[PDB]
Amino acid sequence: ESADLRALAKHLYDSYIKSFPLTKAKARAILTGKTTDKSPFVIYDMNSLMMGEDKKEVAIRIFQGCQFRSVEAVQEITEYAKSIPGFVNLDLNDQVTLLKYGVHEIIYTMLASLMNKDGVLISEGQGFMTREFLKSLRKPFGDFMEPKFEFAVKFNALELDDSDLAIFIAVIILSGDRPGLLNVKPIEDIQDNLLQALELQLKLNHPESSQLFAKLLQKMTDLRQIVTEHVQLLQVIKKTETDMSLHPLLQEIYKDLY
């Protein structure tokens, strides 16, 4: 019933606010100047970066920074997942599998909130690293960000807000087609409800947005490809750059992933 679907929407929004300190609303505010004097420090070259770091090779320090921020993101996303109704009653191995295979799709969804066509907010909104600087990084590290910019730009053009994103991310986490799931059916029943909630949210929140639900679902597909490509790059780094490694939490996620 539609009142239940709205209660679910609001619960997911409340839980998203409680799980994620940096919301798209706040990110977009920073990106567009609608906060205060504390305008972000712009990192557009190597001097910028040194100047900014104040308040190994450069590519590798950026890599290691993103991995550390990724650990905190996994933790917040896990906390969010535990607030999706039904999730904590799933077999615990299935919870692990949904997070293992879904967390990166969610990471890149939420990273898009921090992005525009020219760069990305870093250091919880205090800095802005330019697209051209990230692109300048040597191979393979210069290949990380660019397809995410390509994704973010088209994704942000749908103009989803935090309330929409909360249900979008829940739908993705509760995907019944992850490898190695023990009980697919209870996952699919939860997802089916989330999807109905998402459909109603998008109709009410974006009534004139043409085929917005369909376009959204399509994005969930595009995220999987973003992640496949990202994981292939991580593999290359592991094979050819082995002078370093991931955090243990990220190692768990990545073990036997694709």
Partner: peptide, 10 residues
């Protein structure tokens, strides 16, 4: 494992 720990913390 660390994932299990995150999932079961209250």
């Amino acid at each position: 494992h660390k994932l299990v720990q995150l999932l079961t913390t209250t």
